[PDB]
């Protein structure tokens, strides 16, 4: 199609306009006292939300270049949110800052590549300082505290999260589920989770969580690739007749088969989800065999001879629940007699015994840990079903925050951590004047989020930022009560992973956008 291209400064100012629109839309929700954003819907009743994720997702500008700028910033912010569990608004605000001062410096005639190098150096030093400043969260008390803080200062949610982590381990698989009755049940079942996401977003059954949930699906395990529909069509017909959903775990599903599956999914004829098998090579075969033993259904391997056409309904695996996220999927309480699992664990143990290379032994150890760890499911209970749904959402959010905290650690929230890091790094220097300008740009950008939070709070951002910079350690400003002091003690927590990932992804997108020289769009 016909293309219109912008070269140099005009493209950059279009980019800046787009990112400014996106960040102005999404930034008012930042902070405990954040403004509301009215999102119009075609249904008739607009949705009033103060969540940055929804506001960012709704933004789609008209001008093509501003639209692309907003789309890149939104994409990197979404990547940060998925990686960490939170911080998309912080990442967007940081990106808008870095882009604004970086493009302002570029217009001054400085070399964009040196600015990018300086920004990257400053962000690397900031990550190092943030790791130094991070407070570890490993014992049960800190886990419970983080869970409580994340779930709007609720002690029950933190207690449940800490109990689950103690039961299954800090690296174990923990899942929430609707619970019957007032009591909150917590039991460990035989399950598995591997980092594999849905093939297409149209497979999503729950748009609220952006995940694919299956009430009680069937498991299809084929080591071959699926491109044609005729081989698997008898199995799909059989499972549709059985009245249950189907999970397809193949090496790769694409072509006509994927399109047919997507069409059947959106038309509501049958609810089936397809996900690629974990790993590659013989590791993928071993994982498929492990899943087969867990779900009690023999894997369809064309090498030994069985085919998809001859596959029976009973040959398919079965499990209680299957949850597929954007990048990870979980199998919960797969049906299968326990001696098979014990035998598989034993064989993996001998494979450890004769394992020679370190990496193969590590992979097999990870395999056996995943297989024998199980899945600890939390069944949230409440007196009222809507209260139960709200508690389930809060518990899921607290679980994400607690997992991030256990991974990295906890640092002062509310933007205080970035302020402290910038104050520590104010003495950093590069190898050129442009690199030094980039470093200063990065430091001011790191200061920006706290300024935005206290601007939403209504105070003067400059005074609060200066006072927080003057302080040391975790001392900061609590916008909820308009008081200073130790942010950790006051209970304003942010996992180190969230802030680190937000800063890194904002820096990445800002470096990409600073060095852009041209863009190509379709004509309006």
From Swiss-Prot:
It is an enzyme of class 5 (isomerase). Phosphorylated reversibly during heat shock. Can be UMPylated on a tyrosine residue by SelO/YdiU, probably under stress conditions. The modification N6-acetyllysine is found at residue 116. During the substrate-folding cycle, the two GroEL rings separate for effective substrate binding and chaperonin activity. Ring separation is triggered by ATP binding to the trans ring of the asymmetric GroEL:GroES complex and avoids formation of functionally impaired symmetric GroEL:GroES2 complexes. Activity of the GroEL-GroES chaperonin complex requires Mg-ATP. UMPylation of the chaperone by SelO/YdiU negatively regulates its activity, and may facilitate survival under stress conditions. It is found in: Cytoplasm. The modification N6-succinyllysine is found at residues 33, 50, 116, 276, 320, 389. GO terms for cellular component: cytosol; GroEL-GroES complex; membrane. PANTHER family: 60 KDA HEAT SHOCK PROTEIN, MITOCHONDRIAL. Belongs to the chaperonin (HSP60) family. This is Chaperonin GroEL.
């Amino acid at each position: 199609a016909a293309k219109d291209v912008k070269f140099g400064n005009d493209a950059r100012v279009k980019m800046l306009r787009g990112v400014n629109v996106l960040a102005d839309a999404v930034k008012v929700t930042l902070g405990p006292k954040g403004r509301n954003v009215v999102l119009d819907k075609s249904f008739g009743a607009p949705t009033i939300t103060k969540d940055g994720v929804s506001v960012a997702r709704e933004i789609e500008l008209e001008d093509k270049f501003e639209n692309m700028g907003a789309q890149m910033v939104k994409e990197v912010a979404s990547k940060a949110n998925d990686a960490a569990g939170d911080g998309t608004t912080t990442a967007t605000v940081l990106a808008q800052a870095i882009i604004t001062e970086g493009l302002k410096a570029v217009a001054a005639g400085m070399n964009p590549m040196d600015l990018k190098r300086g920004i990257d150096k400053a962000v690397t030093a900031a990550v190092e300082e943030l790791k130094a400043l991070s407070v570890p969260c490993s014992d049960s008390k800190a886990i419970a505290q983080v869970g409580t803080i994340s779930a709007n200062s609720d002690e029950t949610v933190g207690k449940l999260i800490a109990e689950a982590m103690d039961k299954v381990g800090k690296e174990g698989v923990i899942t929430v589920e609707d619970g019957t009755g007032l009591q909150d049940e917590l039991d460990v079942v035989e399950g598995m989770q591997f980092d594999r996401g849905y093939l297409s977003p149209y497979f999503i059954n729950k748009p609220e969580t952006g995940a694919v949930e299956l009430e009680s699906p069937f498991i299809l395990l084929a080591d071959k690739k699926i491109s044609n529909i005729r081989e698997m069509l008898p199995v799909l017909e059989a499972v549709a007749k059985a009245g249950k959903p189907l999970l397809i775990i193949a090496e790769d599903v694409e072509g006509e088969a994927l399109a047919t599956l997507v069409v059947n999914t959106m038309r509501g004829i049958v609810k089936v989800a397809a996900v690629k098998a974990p790993g590659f090579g013989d590791r993928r075969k071993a994982m498929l065999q492990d899943i087969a033993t867990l779900t009690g259904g023999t894997v369809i391997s064309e090498e030994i001879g069985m085919e998809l056409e001859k596959a029976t309904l009973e040959d398919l695996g079965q499990a209680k629940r299957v949850v597929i996220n954007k990048d990870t999927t979980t199998i919960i309480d797969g049906v299968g007699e326990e001696a098979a699992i014990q035998g598989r664990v034993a064989q993996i143990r001998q494979q450890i015994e004769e394992a020679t290379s370190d990496y193969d032994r590590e992979k097999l150890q990870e395999r056996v840990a995943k297989l024998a760890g199980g899945v600890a499911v939390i069944k949230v209970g409440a007196a009222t079903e809507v209260e139960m749904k709200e508690k389930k959402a809060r518990v899921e959010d607290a679980l994400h925050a607690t997992r991030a905290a256990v991974e990295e650690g906890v640092v002062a929230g509310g933007g205080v951590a970035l302020i402290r890091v910038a104050s520590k790094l104010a003495d950093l220097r590069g190898q050129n004047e442009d690199q030094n300008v980039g470093i200063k740009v990065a430091l001011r950008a790191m200061e920006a989020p706290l300024r935005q939070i206290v601007l939403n709070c209504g105070e003067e951002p400059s005074v609060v930022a200066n006072t927080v910079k003057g302080g040391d350690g975790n001392y900061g400003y609590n916008a909820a009560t308009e008081e200073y002091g130790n942010m950790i003690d006051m209970g304003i927590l942010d996992p180190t992973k969230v802030t680190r990932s937000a800063l890194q992804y904002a820096a990445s997108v800002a470096g990409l956008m600073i060095t852009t020289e041209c863009m190509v769009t379709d004509l309006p």
